[PDB]
DNA sequence: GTGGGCGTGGCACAGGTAAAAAGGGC
DNA sequence: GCCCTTTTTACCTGTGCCACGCCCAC
């Protein structure tokens, strides 16, 4: 047939596009209790909620979000039309937002520069400079009630609550497991299909996501940051050194309940215990 | 032949800044 | 609508758990 609206990937068959559109369904757990439309975050659902309010608003037809001013909606719609109406009058490069062009202008001469007093950061307006300057005074206005940790925004504070709640709203339809982030469900669903889009130029191995590719590459790079102060051996990961440190005291903290043998790391004990079972 | 030390794979994850995107006085 | 302000999401990379393949001691 053709492609998808959300992702846009071509499809040989219609049944392939439909079995693919169903993957978006798991990524959007915030469903409107009045019309069913679903969204990846409560913030975005709240944008959609305005269509059910008697107050005027301006809905985008293509994804059901609405705004309190027509100018907001029209600017927003450029995400769908792909228009880049703000052109650098000097080098010609085109951007979707005036805010993007403003930042880009610092790369050319004569821009208005908002330089940090205390480091080499520079910004295009005072509000951005001001927000950055909080990182020098240490002010983090949004504080977590459970642990006290401070955050730059209520969004970041919201996101961090996952450590206390364990909530996993993003559900896999094939196996049922839940995830804290839609991006991890996406990665998980790539693992189901063997869809490994990130490839290592040196050996060719493919991975489902950037972080697994990145750590893998350290084997080729020799990048072993954790060094043992006692014997000088280096490792890729903090927890190998941690286990190595143990190797020095000879502490085998894992013992088999059935036969009494002891092990240095839990995955040797765990492997050992399937000999019984 | 077997089992376990060893390094690294697979996985679900946090929290930082960069970037995108919504908000608003007039 | 301009001109920013303010909020929300993307991108990045280190993390610890157990699993897996390799290999040598036994
Ligand atoms: Mg400076
Ligand atoms: Zn799609
Ligand atoms: Zn609705
Ligand atoms: Zn839209
Ligand atoms: Zn330019
Ligand atoms: Zn600074
Ligand atoms: Zn907390
Ligand atoms: Zn699954
Ligand atoms: Zn490689
Ligand atoms: Zn050592
Ligand atoms: Zn045992």
């Amino acid at each position: 047939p053709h492609k998808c609206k959300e992702c846009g990937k071509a499809f040989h068959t219609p049944s392939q596009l439909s079995h693919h559109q169903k993957l978006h369904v798991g990524e959007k757990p915030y469903k409107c209790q009045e019309c069913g439309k679903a969204f990846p975050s409560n913030a975005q659902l709240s944008l959609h909620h305005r269509v059910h309010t008697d107050e005027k608003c301006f809905e985008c037809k293509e994804c059901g979000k609405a705004f309190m001013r027509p100018s907001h909606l029209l600017r927003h719609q450029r995400i769908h039309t792909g228009e880049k109406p703000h052109k650098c009058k000097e080098c010609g490069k085109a951007f979707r937002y005036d805010t993007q062009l403003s930042l880009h202008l610092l790369t050319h001469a004569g821009a208005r520069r908002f330089e940090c007093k205390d480091c080499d950061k520079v910004y295009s307006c005072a509000s951005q400079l001001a927000l950055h300057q909080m990182s020098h005074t240490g002010e983090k206005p949004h504080k977590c009630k459970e642990c006290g940790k401070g955050f730059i925004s209520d969004s970041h504070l919201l996101r961090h609550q996952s450590v206390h709640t364990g909530e996993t709203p993003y559900k896999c339809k094939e196996c049922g497991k839940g995830f804290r982030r839609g991006s991890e469900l996406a990665r998980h669903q790539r693992a189901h299909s063997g869809d490994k889009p990130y490839k290592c130029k040196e050996c060719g191995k493919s991975f489902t996501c950037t972080t697994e590719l990145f750590r893998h590459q350290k084997v080729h790079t020799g990048d072993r940051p954790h060094k043992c102060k006692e014997c000088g051996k280096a490792f890729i990961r903090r927890s190998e050194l941690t286990h190595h440190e143990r190797s020095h005291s000879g502490e085998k903290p894992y013992e088999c309940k059935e036969c009494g043998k002891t092990f240095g790391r839990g995955s040797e004990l765990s492997r050992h215990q399937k000999i019984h079972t």
Side-chain angles (χ1 to χ4, degrees), chain A residues 1 4 7-8 10 12 14-18 20 23-24 26 28-30 32-53 56-60 62-83 85-86 88 90-92 94-120 122-144 146-172 175-200 203-204 206-220 222-226 228 230-245 247-250 252-256 258-277:
Chain A
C4 152
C7 83
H12 277 123
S15 293
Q16 304 181 335
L17 172 145
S18 286
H20 170 97
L23 313 183
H24 295 348
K28 303 182 188 200
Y30 300 86
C32 172
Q33 281 289 82
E34 302 219 304
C35 73
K37 266 167 172 165
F39 300 88
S41 87
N42 209 65
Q44 291 182 46
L45 174 68
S46 276
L47 303 179
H48 162 73
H49 273 179
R50 317 183 156 133
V51 302
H52 310 319
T53 63
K56 188 48 183 177
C57 74
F58 312 87
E59 168 182 359
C60 164
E62 251 201 60
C63 69
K65 272 143 174 212
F67 310 84
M68 294 293 267
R69 271 143 67 153
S71 168
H72 292 167
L73 158 67
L74 283 308
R75 169 190 57 198
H76 154 106
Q77 293 180 326
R78 320 170 163 165
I79 308 174
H80 317 278
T81 73
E83 174 182 22
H86 304 277
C88 177
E90 174 173 344
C91 91
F95 305 80
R96 160 180 318 164
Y97 305 123
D98 47 18
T99 58
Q100 297 170 316
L101 183 48
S102 304
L103 174 87
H104 160 88
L105 285 171
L106 299 165
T107 71
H108 304 332
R112 202 187 162 199
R113 312 183 71 77
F114 287 80
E115 313 267 13
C116 186
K117 178 192 196 301
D118 301 318
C119 75
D120 291 348
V122 60
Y123 299 90
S124 58
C125 62
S127 57
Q128 304 184 290
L129 180 52
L131 182 120
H132 164 71
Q133 273 279 358
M134 296 199 325
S135 86
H136 289 301
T137 69
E139 157 184 25
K140 307 274 196 181
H142 307 275
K143 315 280 200 192
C144 179
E146 263 271 10
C147 54
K149 185 168 170 61
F151 290 95
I152 214 82
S153 87
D154 181 76
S155 284
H156 290 81
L157 173 58
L158 177 50
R159 162 184 80 177
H160 148 93
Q161 301 298 307
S162 66
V163 317
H164 306 305
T165 68
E167 245 121 291
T168 54
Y170 304 88
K171 303 298 191 199
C172 177
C175 81
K177 217 160 161 188
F179 307 85
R180 310 184 171 191
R181 300 194 182 175
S183 62
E184 292 301 325
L185 166 56
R187 178 206 51 75
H188 177 86
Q189 295 190 283
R190 284 201 294 287
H192 271 316
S193 56
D195 180 350
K196 293 175 181 175
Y198 303 94
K199 189 187 178 192
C200 171
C203 71
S206 51
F207 307 82
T208 60
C209 59
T210 52
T211 189
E212 299 175 20
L213 173 60
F214 195 79
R215 189 181 67 188
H216 158 67
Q217 295 179 313
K218 294 166 135 60
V219 165
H220 313 296
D223 179 26
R224 284 160 168 76
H226 308 269
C228 167
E230 177 172 327
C231 78
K233 195 144 155 184
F235 306 91
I236 297 181
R237 335 183 175 170
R238 187 174 209 95
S239 85
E240 315 176 51
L241 194 148
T242 284
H243 298 110
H244 174 94
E245 306 290 37
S247 200
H248 283 304
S249 73
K252 288 140 170 276
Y254 307 89
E255 96 175 321
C256 179
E258 304 282 347
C259 60
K261 281 147 152 199
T262 64
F263 303 90
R265 303 179 333 197
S267 54
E268 278 70 62
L269 170 65
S270 184
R271 174 173 73 171
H272 166 77
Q273 281 171 352
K274 308 155 174 214
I275 309 163
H276 307 305
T277 63

